């Protein structure tokens, strides 16, 4: 269902502002720089790249994917994407002290507080926080993540992904 096609146009330098990673004989988006050709086509962290310029990424190493992006042909980089296959959404409600009930280090969930909304909704550890109420938190400081949560109202919708994606 979550399949889409994107056409990327290479920068003045000849770059696209994207880093790819090999996971389970597939290729996934590892990093998207803001205001880059990749950000322009809605490429998100964790998105699976199915093919690049008419070639299946199946079983390509991170090295091969990186080389393919460099040895391309200018204004024409074609991709078929499967939207964040390991993405999950968890809705939580703040308590009276304004907590959802989880602890995190470098955007990764490490513990779930007992008798909290995160406990109730079965939030998992060893999972990276991707978004809070649709806003991207990937690669922000833990304090920037915390400040965003504190300002997200009482209903907090988080997008997560297992740690092995990052």
């Amino acid at each position: 269902s979550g399949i889409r096609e994107v056409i990327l146009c290479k920068d003045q330098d000849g770059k696209i502002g994207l880093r790819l990673k090999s996971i389970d004989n597939g290729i996934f988006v590892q990093l998207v720089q803001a205001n880059s050709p990749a950000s322009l086509v809605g490429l998100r962290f964790g998105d699976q790249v199915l093919q690049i310029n008419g070639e299946n990424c199946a079983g390509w190493s991170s090295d091969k994917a990186h080389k393919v992006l460099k040895q391309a042909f200018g204004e024409k980089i074609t991709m078929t994407i499967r939207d964040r296959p390991f993405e999950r959404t968890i809705t939580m409600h703040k308590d009276s002290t304004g907590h959802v009930g989880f602890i995190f280090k470098n955007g990764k969930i490490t513990s779930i507080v007992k008798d909290s909304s995160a406990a109730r909704n079965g939030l998992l550890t060893e999972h990276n926080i991707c978004e809070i109420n649709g806003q991207n938190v990937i690669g922000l400081k833990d304090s920037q993540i915390a400040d965003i949560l504190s300002t997200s109202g009482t209903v907090v919708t988080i997008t997560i992904m297992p740690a092995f994606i990052f």
């Binding site: 989880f102 602890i103 490490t110």
Partner: peptide
Amino acid sequence: KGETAV
């Protein structure tokens, strides 16, 4: 910073 609780 070590662990952030939210």
